[PDB]
Amino acid sequence: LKFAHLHQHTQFSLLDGAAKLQDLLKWVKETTPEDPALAMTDHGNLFGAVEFYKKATAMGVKPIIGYEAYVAAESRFDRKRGGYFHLTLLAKDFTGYQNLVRLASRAYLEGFYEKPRIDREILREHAQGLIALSGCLGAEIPQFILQDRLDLAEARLNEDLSIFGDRFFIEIQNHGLPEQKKVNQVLKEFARKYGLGMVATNDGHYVRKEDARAHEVLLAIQSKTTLDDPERWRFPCDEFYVKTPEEMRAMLPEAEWGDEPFDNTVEIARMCDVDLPIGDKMVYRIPRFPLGRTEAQYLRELTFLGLLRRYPDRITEAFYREVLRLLDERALAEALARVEEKAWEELRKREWTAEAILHRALYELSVIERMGFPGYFLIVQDYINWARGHGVSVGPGRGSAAGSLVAYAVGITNIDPLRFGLLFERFLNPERVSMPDIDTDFSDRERDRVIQYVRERYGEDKVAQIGTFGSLASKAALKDVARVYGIPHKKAEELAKLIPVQFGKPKPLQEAELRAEMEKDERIRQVIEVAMRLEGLNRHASVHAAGVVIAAEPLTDLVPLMRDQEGRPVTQYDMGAVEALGLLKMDFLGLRTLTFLDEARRIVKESKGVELDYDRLPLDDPKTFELLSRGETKGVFQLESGGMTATVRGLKPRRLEDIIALVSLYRPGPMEHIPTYIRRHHGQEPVSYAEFPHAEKYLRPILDETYGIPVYQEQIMQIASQVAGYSLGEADLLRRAMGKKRVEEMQKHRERFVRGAKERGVPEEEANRLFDMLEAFANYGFNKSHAAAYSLLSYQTAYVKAHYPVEFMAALLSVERHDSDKVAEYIRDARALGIPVLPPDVNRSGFDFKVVGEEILFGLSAVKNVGEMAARAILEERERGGPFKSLGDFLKRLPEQVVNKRALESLVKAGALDAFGDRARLLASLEPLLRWAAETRERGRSGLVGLFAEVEEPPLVEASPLDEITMLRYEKEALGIYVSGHPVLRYPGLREVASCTIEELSEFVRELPGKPKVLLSGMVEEVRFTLSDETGALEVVKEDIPLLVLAEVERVLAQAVWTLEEVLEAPKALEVEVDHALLDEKGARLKSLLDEHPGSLPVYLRVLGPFGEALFALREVRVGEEALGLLEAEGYRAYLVPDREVF
Ligand SMILES: [Cl-]
Ligand SMILES: [Cl-]
Ligand SMILES: [Mg+2]
Ligand SMILES: [Mg+2]
Ligand SMILES: [Zn+2]
Ligand SMILES: [Zn+2]
């Protein structure tokens, strides 16, 4: 006797599934050795399939691919507020697999209501190659039976029979459920009546019986409730696990069920021969390109016609002509394209010269053609060179890609791969076949449009973004479980901080060494197990930012789909899984820095009429480096880090290759090689090669550009390529194989190394230690291809900040104008940078942030109630009739029809109409001026020329000025942020008692004790109230009332709060403000001046230190109030501040 499950859910039935793929697949194997099988039947997705099939296939288990599908009462198109039912589906042959992919695809695109649902209409369309099973208790035929509508169930059994035929079975499962008794007792009659045959299953959602609660909390996490709610999601019993053949016949006896429902499980799984193109198979689905030209010929053509642009001074019209005479401008490329590979190699045999370029070019192409990747390069180049002409910034490139010359010739890459040390052989190793990945950056604003270009260009059915499935984290796992177990949040987090952090993410709970915390509480015992019993599970399905696919055949025909909340065609198979099926995949990353370069250039073009042609700037521009050297990185890509900034200020880099090497070495590990870089760079330490005297004549060239440090991997490859006699290709393999650290496969390369090293120079003693030097540096060394690429951007950024520093800031502000916080911030940076930032101005403002003269001026768009039409409207009516002359002249040119009263209100509140006088006066005048305006046209449309038709706007109505607090209040209501001040500046008391500003909080606090308490004072902005200084914003746990807050910190949690008038009531103290320039003979100058008027007020000292500022609260002495009057009577600034103590 034996058995094999055909209904088993997995980690991939995301909401309710708790069976991890691995320990499930062994549990099935360890149960039955003989021809074991498992069907993967996830709830309405195919997420598992691939990554499952391949795990079981190399484990020793035959897999079967399946789908517990949601079938709608009626049409998948319905949206009824009947339901949706279950249905067990298995794919028997490969066509079946396709039709499964299709269904789950369609269930998502065409029929998504709550769950993704298929019609019986489409099921019938796609039945070819499928076996169905009557279904779990919630499926159709059983359900109807439960309802005493036998007459419908049999009718629906007939229907289903008309669809699959002798490939539909009656599903019999049993748990201790009375509903199952009645359903089967009839299902049993059916299978005998129509002549159907029964298959025994039992719907595993967990692996082994002990996974009961472990699972029954996974629910409590998907339901987000306590273990004791109730009403919390629960299953009906603890019986949904991968049972033994023996535990089965316990739910299905012998004299009641017979051998048929077992010997059918085995026999089905056998007839289910399904194979996924993978490994042994996997054909490259490189999509075709449209063009009397070879796929490869064109790419060749485009390259030539490219170099000529790329290298003006050294590849010419005349040059190509010379080549062809050894055998228009476009007309030469068209021809050089048609030289064959037997014909080419009759020239080489008869500093980067004109030839040198040809060779490398022709070589690259030779390796491209031979490999089968010319098409690829086209597809890629095409969409990129489109984005250029269509206002979509494209980054210089990323990763290995950069180093191919063809890549750079055809505008895929955009950095001269041979002016830097970039390598083709790192991007495409000639001596092993592997899909080269070409990732590309894009202006993030515009990225999707490129995807759309591809989408429309290659087919709406061939183009999708790739799926991503987050892992439950060991750290997080433990949290969520503890929520469930009725536990105080704190000790929860005291359990989280046990678990290590080995690299980026937390260590698995498998190895996790203060375990004695278990043996204390029996509550915690489970919590810890349960968390590791859940470790590997899944969250939900996000689109990958970068992932895109271009299939060659319709996607639906191999890879299933989804549409995400904002209508993206998404793949159900993950990154690897896709790439494992062998599909053309690519990253289309979004990149802020690019968008920022765009708005800068626009702002620059407007400011001073200068075309910023980023792909044509000198890379030796002094004033750029001198900035980075002064360490003014603030807005400059990549080197923005707290720490990294400091480094640069010491390195003082003079040429790009320094930014490149800085960037490359700055990360834990290599880091240390940085000081050396610096002392070598400042020119104070020789760069010596006495350790490999014979190898020097090979090293210097490679490592001199890097003050002697193997930083870049290419630098490594080259060393081997040159010293060992390695083909640059082979060289790569070396670096590759030293990465894999294959214990004893290394001593094979060692030999091949020395053996060649002799034949070139070094006498092995050097060789060995040199190889030692390689395996030493290679583990940390970097990809220059990538490094240099990005570096260029940092330069590009720095250059702007250096040469156009105002507009720079505007572009900053502009780009992130959608962050009330960042804007405030960017403002404050630019404010204390010599630049003023101005309110909008109906006269001077452009639409967006604008740079006028030397100031950053707002736009009208930024005004909160003003429509967008109305902003542009204002403008155009201000550019056909010139500059606005009065608020009258405004309201007659812009009727209420266009700018409503509300609009007007804010527009004044903003200060756009400041150009006219006092604000409060304006606001009240509006209404009676609109009564005037509207009346003017009534006169105007009644004949009457321009004197009888205008009683010209009587002067503005009158009212007392807007006091600051009330005035500032409006600005923000109107502009999201405050301009020209801040409430907290008006009543200083709160400043003077506060321990910090919001800015400094982070840096004052970290260094004190562990988890400190502190007092903070600013403005409130929430009903998790938000607190603001003139210096920042903090989440802390009504509107426009100032407070002082005593709160504990780690994000900051409040303990106590006081009202302004409670703070101006608590007794006062004296604070002398003192400069750092004080004498020995002053601290006892002050000391005596205080001694002479003692009392009961404490004394405080603000000592403005060179780097920071601290509050020395005197000592013994306590002054008696009268002191302030006699104290301001010397070069000392003073205040009667509230007394910091009390709080
Ligand atoms: Cl060295
Ligand atoms: Cl060294
Ligand atoms: Mg059905
Ligand atoms: Mg890629
Ligand atoms: Zn379920
Ligand atoms: Zn099920």
From Swiss-Prot:
Pfam families: DNA_pol3_alpha, DNA_pol3_finger, HHH_6, PHP
Annotated localization: Cytoplasm
Enzyme Commission no: 2.7.7.7
SS bonds (residue pairs): none
Top-rank taxon: Bacteria
GO BP of this protein: DNA replication
One Gene Ontology term of the molecular function aspect: DNA-directed DNA polymerase activity
Keyword Cytoplasm part of the UniProt annotation: yes
Subunit structure: DNA polymerase III contains a core (composed of alpha, epsilon and theta chains) that associates with a tau subunit. This core dimerizes to form the PolIII' complex. PolIII' associates with the gamma complex (composed of gamma, delta, delta', psi and chi chains) and with the beta chain to form the complete DNA polymerase III complex.
Similarity comment text for this entry: Belongs to the DNA polymerase type-C family. DnaE subfamily.
Function field: DNA polymerase III is a complex, multichain enzyme responsible for most of the replicative synthesis in bacteria. This DNA polymerase also exhibits 3' to 5' exonuclease activity. The alpha chain is the DNA polymerase.
Entry keywords, A to Z: Cytoplasm, DNA replication, DNA-directed DNA polymerase, Nucleotidyltransferase, Transferase
Catalysed reactions listed for this entry: DNA(n) + a 2'-deoxyribonucleoside 5'-triphosphate = DNA(n+1) + diphosphate
Species, as recorded: Thermus aquaticus
Protein name as annotated: DNA polymerase III subunit alpha
CDD domains the record matches: DnaE_OBF (cd04485), PHP_PolIIIA_DnaE3 (cd12113)
GO cellular component: cytoplasm
